[PDB]
Design a protein around this ligand. Structure first.
Ligand SMILES: [K+]
Ligand SMILES: [K+]
Ligand SMILES: [K+]
Ligand SMILES: [K+]
Ligand SMILES: [K+]
Ligand SMILES: [K+]
Ligand SMILES: [K+]
Ligand SMILES: [K+]
Ligand SMILES: [K+]
Ligand SMILES: [K+]
Ligand SMILES: [Mg+2]
Ligand SMILES: [Mg+2]
Ligand SMILES: [Mg+2]
Ligand SMILES: [Mg+2]
Ligand SMILES: [Mg+2]
Ligand SMILES: [Mg+2]
Ligand SMILES: [Mg+2]
Ligand SMILES: [Mg+2]
Ligand SMILES: [Mg+2]
Ligand SMILES: [Mg+2]
Ligand SMILES: [Mg+2]
Ligand SMILES: [Mg+2]
Ligand SMILES: [Mg+2]
Ligand SMILES: [Mg+2]
Ligand SMILES: [Mg+2]
Ligand SMILES: [Mg+2]
Ligand SMILES: [Mg+2]
Ligand SMILES: [Mg+2]
Ligand SMILES: [Mg+2]
Ligand SMILES: [Mg+2]
Ligand SMILES: [Mg+2]
Ligand SMILES: [Mg+2]
Ligand SMILES: [Mg+2]
Ligand SMILES: [Mg+2]
Ligand SMILES: [Mg+2]
Ligand SMILES: [Mg+2]
Ligand SMILES: [Mg+2]
Ligand SMILES: [Mg+2]
Ligand SMILES: [Mg+2]
Ligand SMILES: [Mg+2]
Lengths: 168, 56
RNA sequence: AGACAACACUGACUAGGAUAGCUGGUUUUCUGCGAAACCUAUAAUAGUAGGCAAUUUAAGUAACAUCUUAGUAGGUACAGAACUUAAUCUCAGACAAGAUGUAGAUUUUCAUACCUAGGUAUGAAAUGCAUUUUUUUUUGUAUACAUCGGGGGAUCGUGAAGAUUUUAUCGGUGAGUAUGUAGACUCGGAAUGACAAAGAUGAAUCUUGAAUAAUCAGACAUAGAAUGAUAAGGUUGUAUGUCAAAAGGGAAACAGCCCAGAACAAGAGUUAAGGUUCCAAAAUUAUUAUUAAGUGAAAUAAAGAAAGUUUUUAUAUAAGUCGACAAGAAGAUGGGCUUGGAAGCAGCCAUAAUUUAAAGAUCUCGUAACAGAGCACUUGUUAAAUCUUAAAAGCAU
RNA sequence: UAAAUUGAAAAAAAAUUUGGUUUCAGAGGAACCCCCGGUUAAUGGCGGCCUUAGCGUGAGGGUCCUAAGGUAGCGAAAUGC
RNA sequence: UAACUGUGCAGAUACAGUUUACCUCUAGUUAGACGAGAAGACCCUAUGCAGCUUUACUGUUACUAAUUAUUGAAUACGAUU
RNA sequence: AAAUUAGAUGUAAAAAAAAAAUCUUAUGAGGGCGGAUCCGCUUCUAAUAUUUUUUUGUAGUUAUUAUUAUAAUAAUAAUCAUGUUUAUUACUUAAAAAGCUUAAUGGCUUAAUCUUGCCUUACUGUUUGAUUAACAACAAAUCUUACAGUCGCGUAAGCGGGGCAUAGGAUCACAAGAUACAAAAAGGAAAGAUCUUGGAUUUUUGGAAAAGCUACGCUAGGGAUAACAGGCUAAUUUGCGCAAGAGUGUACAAAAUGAGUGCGCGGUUUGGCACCUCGAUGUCGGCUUGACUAAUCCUCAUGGAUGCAGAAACUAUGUAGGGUACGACUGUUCGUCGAUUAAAAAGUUACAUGAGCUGGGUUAAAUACGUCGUGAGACAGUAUGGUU
RNA sequence: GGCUGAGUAGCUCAAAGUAGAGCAUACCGUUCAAAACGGUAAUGAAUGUGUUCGAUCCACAGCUCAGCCACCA
């Protein structure tokens, strides 16, 4: 399969589900691991579709065409969305397959790029991909600390300092 | 143990949930002791603690 | 024409004899207690029965509730990537020895020619860099002997055949204490809730005997889900409460929200939620900042823009920051190619240099093409003694 | 079940016959029906697919099925979405 | 027995806030009082009705068929055997 | 590519001895002390476990090497072996899977699997305690216990009242056996009663022998429930805006133009929900008479426009004072079309207004066509007529 | 919008242990030549994926599809 079309069966339906909301101090997926830069969702957790992620890649390729780069995708559309007709009435079972989607938590990286290009040339690519993706996104470099919830672990801040009941 | 794998009590005592690594290393058992303050599994070298259960 | 048969006809009038699990109604007072809209069954779903369970007042209690201490059952949140699921990333191979060659230095050891045990000669070896080595015609050690096909290209080649090598191409296989993903993954793992034991406390709240009901259209708030469209004052579960059957104060008005449970009066009584300039009971009460928009002040409109303003963190400055103004901004050289023409400036390739106070084989205009005007950059003048520039955050537009 | 006979004749039934009582049972034997035929101004029913003289058109030629495949006529009609 | 906005069994003369209006009739007019009239014919419900329909269930008849009885003979022809 | 067979982990098998400490146990010393075997405190002893603990010993046998005088000593190597080497025995070999009567889940490898021997407890009667008092009642159910009777297997202990577990409907009537209960005067019998057992899409499976139309319809009821409008919601629309900028524009993103998208407003469409009204909220168009919104068709002021010479027009910002007509077609809203005009734009108000009018459409009784149905009849199929 | 039934040789049609029989086609022979005729041959189970010892066959999802229902206001 692929990151937009998995090797799953469309017959077996899936529940709506909910994105991951780490409430225990988890930095899972909030850092650049492969490339030099990244694109972080910094507003709220959502469920991005395979059509909104396909256009994001096409928007980055169009802006960086003719240049040497390596685009990494850190999200997979492994959630089958099933929609019943918006003209039908309530009941009569669950809806039919509509599209593949992926649930993303807050402050999680979406794309990562590694190439012999200028930083400002990559910003414009990630800036255009954010105006066409659902929500708000941010430009992230490699080496910067992870994010626990909506708070970055900057200036020596650790996950245990956030769990300490005393903060004042 | 019953036909449907139901565990019954064979005597009047107190339920105990324990693990006997000597009898089987990866099993968890259920037992009934006559004294509430007993600790299972009994040591293999201690005498059997049994009650008469008879009236004269 | 279901037309007419004397108010009536898909079957008149009149006397006699019905039912209605449906709708409506059911009349004095005081006093005590006080639900439910759930489960199971039903030709059953707006009905009914049995339970849970409301009431009466007797007998019991090692009753019931709650906390404490000790113990038990079970795998949720979370967290994680073990097993399973999706996708992605990295890797798929190394050393020692031996062997095979070369330029040497010409010393030492050794084998030969000797010579007379050294030297005299001829070879090897030692020493330095290559070369061969994960299955080879190279053994050993350490490891998963550690990878199989399509296809592309290249070098051979046969009457068509195919054969043998390569790739940063597709799929598959092996390795990873690599990254992510979770209703039918849980190796790890709460709080809560549940069960039972003893003790203590408390408002009899518990059980049983006897007697005997109503209810079985629920609603909303909050949390967390399924469903819908991550819509509904939506539908369906779970947890808690209120309403229902609960008045009073607050939320302008208010079944469900925040407080608080109305037997009746008195009090500048004491307080909860909530509030204290006036309507309107009580502060125009003190402290420090922000806003200039009536923003806002008891129902947050979004992304986003910007010499609005404040703070903070950096940073520039009499070595003249910032701004303006004056001049310069070269040469090899119309780079090569392309093109009718391409001279920095259509497009392609290159863009180590040189000389300068500085000057990209060129950032925006201009030319058919040159020319020409600006910029990067460089010098000078004017001039600031808390006064440069940028970012982030707060409140505003 | 009563009587008689027979049997048993040990603590004894049981079997046969007749009376009364109460059941099972069907060679043959009507119509409708089965079978054969007739009747549409009786109730009623009256079809598909490929192929082509060039593109085209389809006279023509292939086949499947039916009791029969809508004939003459009419036809965006009081019938055509 | 006013108007507006909001509220609320979800479309207010009557609640909240604000605004406006001296008391009382006459003739016009019909926007509202979810105006009046008829316990909605539509829709749904009731193990409620009525008429009609049929290869619904269970029945009665017209009609058809055989036979005891009223009811007796004679040849046959023939079959059971 | 796919047939059979043979394989696919490692370790151990001469043998220990001793000192103290930390617990935990004891139907050990009938321990001691308070209240023999009851209970909380208690020393001692014993046993298991735990310390990385203090160590000591690690031989013998066979053989090799070295020294010493064939033997002795030291070191090194091998060593389960008195036993048919096909050795044998103990332990170990992830998970999944196979198997265990059928789906799925859990479980079993130390048996619930497999092989073999003997068997048929897949027994009769009664009965215990449970399923936090089975299924949130009852009933049909499930597991388990004991006594008596008499059978199997096993050396024995003991095991066995079907199957590894969780999915097979009563009564009545009917039929076959047993019990010896009662026998409507009496002796019998019949018909009954108790015990055991069989034959069920009683599948609406706590268990009726059961097809339709009504527009000629009736009664009792329901906003507990649809159609109209309102309310909530905003997927969607025939309603719009903002952000970004692939691309078009001979050149040049933003004069015009704007793919696929993102962030929103709005309440005018089709829906969703079913909150108000079924002891009654009349409904599509037309006429009459308005009121309001501004997202602007005309008129007025005005910015931009290699693409503003002028004129006309495009786009945009102000702005709703006035106007936006006539006719043919259709029941039509809408839409098409004719011919004028400065222009012949829209929307909200119960898709404003039927106690103001109209009644052509939709939606009653009548009738016909086509289609459907065996038929009565039905039809977002079409017609003529129909108390406002 | 919502269900149902079908798909095999070039063309027709038949059929969980099979793929058959026609027509067409091809080769040859008959005729002066062609057709007809005669003789002798070669032609298939859609699209995957499951079930089963084995699938034209059973199951499932697509393509092609045709047919039917889209009723009361
Ligand atoms: K009822
Ligand atoms: K009271
Ligand atoms: K009370
Ligand atoms: K666990
Ligand atoms: K305000
Ligand atoms: K009401
Ligand atoms: K009026
Ligand atoms: K056996
Ligand atoms: K008698
Ligand atoms: K007329
Ligand atoms: Mg975005
Ligand atoms: Mg009629
Ligand atoms: Mg009449
Ligand atoms: Mg309740
Ligand atoms: Mg019943
Ligand atoms: Mg609700
Ligand atoms: Mg409801
Ligand atoms: Mg009530
Ligand atoms: Mg109250
Ligand atoms: Mg107030
Ligand atoms: Mg006071
Ligand atoms: Mg005051
Ligand atoms: Mg050039
Ligand atoms: Mg007969
Ligand atoms: Mg006969
Ligand atoms: Mg004809
Ligand atoms: Mg109002
Ligand atoms: Mg009042
Ligand atoms: Mg009037
Ligand atoms: Mg009123
Ligand atoms: Mg078995
Ligand atoms: Mg119970
Ligand atoms: Mg039932
Ligand atoms: Mg039941
Ligand atoms: Mg009619
Ligand atoms: Mg309602
Ligand atoms: Mg201008
Ligand atoms: Mg004026
Ligand atoms: Mg109207
Ligand atoms: Mg009116």
């Amino acid at each position: 399969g692929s990151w937009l079309e998995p090797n799953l069966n469309r017959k077996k339906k899936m529940m709506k589900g909910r994105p991951r909301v780490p409430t225990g101090g988890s930095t899972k997926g909030t850092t650049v691991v492969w490339g030099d830069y990244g694109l972080r969702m910094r507003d709220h957790h959502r469920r991005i579709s395979a059509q909104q992620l396909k256009l994001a890649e096409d928007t980055i390729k169009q802006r960086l065409r003719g240049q040497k780069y390596r685009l990494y995708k850190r999200v997979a559309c492994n959630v089958g969305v099933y929609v019943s007709g918006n003209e039908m009435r309530m009941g009569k079972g669950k809806g039919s397959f509509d599209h593949w989607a992926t649930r993303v938590a807050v402050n999680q990286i979406i794309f990562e790029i590694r190439g012999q290009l200028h930083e400002q040339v990559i910003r414009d690519a990630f800036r255009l991909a954010g105006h066409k993706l659902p929500g708000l996104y941010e430009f992230v470099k490699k080496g910067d600390p992870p994010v626990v919830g909506i708070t970055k672990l900057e200036d020596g801040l650790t996950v245990e300092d956030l769990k300490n009941p005393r903060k004042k | 143990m019953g036909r449907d794998h139901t565990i019954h009590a064979a005597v009047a005592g107190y339920v105990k949930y324990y693990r006997d690594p000597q009898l089987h290393p990866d099993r968890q058992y259920i037992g009934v002791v006559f004294n509430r303050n007993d600790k299972l599994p009994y040591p293999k070298d201690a005498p059997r603690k049994r009650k008469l259960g008879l009236v004269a």
